[PDB]
Design a protein around this nucleic acid. Structure first.
Lengths: 225, 215
RNA sequence: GGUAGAACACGUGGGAUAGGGGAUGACCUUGUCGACCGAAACACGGUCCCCUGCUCCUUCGAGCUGGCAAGGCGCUCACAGGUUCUAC
């Protein structure tokens, strides 16, 4: 089970440093090339750097030359990307990818990581407020009703929203965050459920914000009417 | 000079079962060391094509890749509802390796009217000192839609935000949220609040309203 | 001490247009320009000539070219000279 787990990303001041780690499992990085590629929010994939398996040769992009440094540990089986003098241009989700074997595939990156977010901003961290959007009593007695949660006034990205501790997936819609005028982020997560089960099934939304270490399990109940 | 790869088009929308081709032109000769990746919104890219003309093990046969000198074509013979993503070409001929601008492939669908719901501010939010009223447009197509807010039968502008989800991979629909934010004093100063939605799937603007303080 | 010859290692000056109806010394190194392997884009270790040519008593054989370029060595021609040996 080839997998890459990344870590070390977060909020960095404009000009600081940060070291991202990329642990591998199911294979040894000593026999493969490891690439780092970044993606700014709403932009395309940008190749950052790469390190080769038997020589340790490194290659960097013209926009991160000198500031960034890619490395790898065979004994710990983990790649690293040390970035210094970070600017707003470097705010992005960073992925580490394994360049597949030359017989099986070619020079393409067969396995990738889920990525880690790096925000280069001098703004501060704020935990979100979670409010229930209860199903309306006057909904014309439809077959299905809608209920959700509003996650408002937090910074920076991201928040993880689930339902029933990750038990309700079908019909769930977690809208992308919207940067409002207060510099904070706000989003909603709604779900469509049969209205005949609002009085029996308990619907709870679970919101996690790791940058502020705030977890909220907000129960959504329809108001008495 | 590094090797830039111009991808074409930047976006398209094809029907289910359609044959979609995406081209990628290299600035110079890159041999056959190009790859085609598929990336879901907020997800890790998957390797679809390696070595220009070879599909990665496990990729369905509907994906294919071809090379004509510096041009590289990624084809989908019969588009599927699960093929919604941004596709990228990446050269591995020399360092620094570069990607393409990307082609966000949309799935064309029959027009579907939205389901409109409205949510008044929570009591917890009223305790916090603000009031955000939410308007939900669920499961519709196409993505274009207009939402207006009426506070005591009066239009609002500038004090409302909106967000749009990505296409579902089983129905190719969209969902839109519209949040109108006010202070507690401004929310309590008025009475009725209405969300008016105009969409192509509707023959008349659908209005969902509520009187504050009443259920 | 002389004459003549040979075997070596040399010096100088030259020589090398052409591959299936036949190129090359199918040497060494470097640069290069390509594909493909070893878990391997660079570095490391390798592969890419059936025929044909050359070599050899690996002789139904066996060994030496992915291409190009330069340099070195080698092959060949001429001019002598040096060392050793042989004969008179």
């Amino acid at each position: 089970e080839v997998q890459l787990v990344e870590s070390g990303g977060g909020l960095v001041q404009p000009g600081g440093s940060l070291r991202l780690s990329c642990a591998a499992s199911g294979f040894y990085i000593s026999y493969s090339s490891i690439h780092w590629v970044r993606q700014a929010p709403g932009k395309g994939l940008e190749w950052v750097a790469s390190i080769s398996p038997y020589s340790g040769s490194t290659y960097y992009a013209d926009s991160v030359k000198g500031r960034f440094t890619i490395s790898a540990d065979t004994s710990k089986n983990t790649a690293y990307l040390q970035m210094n003098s970070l600017r707003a241009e470097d705010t992005a989700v960073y992925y580490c990818a394994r360049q597949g074997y030359r017989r099986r595939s070619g020079r393409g990156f067969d396995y990738w990581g889920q990525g880690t977010l790096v925000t280069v901003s001098s703004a501060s961290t704020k935990g979100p407020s979670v409010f229930p959007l209860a199903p309306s009593s006057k909904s014309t007695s439809g077959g299905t009703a809608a209920l959700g949660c509003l996650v408002k006034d937090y910074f920076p990205e991201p928040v993880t929203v689930s339902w029933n501790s990750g038990a309700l997936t079908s019909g769930v819609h977690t809208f992308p965050a919207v940067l409002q005028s207060s510099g904070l982020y706000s989003l909603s997560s709604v779900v469509t459920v049969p209205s005949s089960s609002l009085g029996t099934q308990t619907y709870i939304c679970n919101v996690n914000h790791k940058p502020s270490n705030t977890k909220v399990d907000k129960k959504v109940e329809p108001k008495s009417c | 000079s590094d090797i830039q790869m111009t991808q074409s088009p930047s976006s398209l929308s094809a029907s289910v079962g359609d044959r979609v081709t995406i081209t990628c032109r290299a600035s110079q000769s890159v041999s056959s060391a190009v790859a085609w990746y598929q990336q879901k919104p907020g997800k890790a890219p998957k390797l679809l094509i390696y070595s220009a003309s070879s599909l990665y093990s496990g990729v369905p046969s509907r994906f294919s890749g071809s090379r004509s000198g510096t041009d590289f074509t990624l084809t989908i013979s019969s588009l599927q509802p699960e093929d919604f993503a941004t596709y990228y070409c990446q050269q591995s001929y020399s360092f620094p390796s570069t990607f393409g601008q990307g082609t966000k492939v949309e799935i064309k669908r029959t027009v579907a009217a939205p389901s409109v719901f409205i949510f008044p501010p929570s009591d917890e939010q009223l305790k916090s000192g603000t009031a955000s009223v939410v308007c939900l447009l669920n499961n519709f197509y196409p993505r274009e839609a207009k939402v207006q807010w009426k506070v005591d039968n009066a239009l609002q502008s500038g004090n409302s935000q909106e967000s749009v989800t990505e296409q579902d991979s089983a129905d190719s629909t969209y969902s839109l949220s519209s949040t109108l934010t006010l202070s507690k004093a401004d929310y309590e100063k008025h009475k009725v609040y209405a969300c008016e939605v105009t969409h192509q799937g509707l023959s008349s603007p659908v209005t969902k309203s509520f009187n504050r303080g009443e259920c």
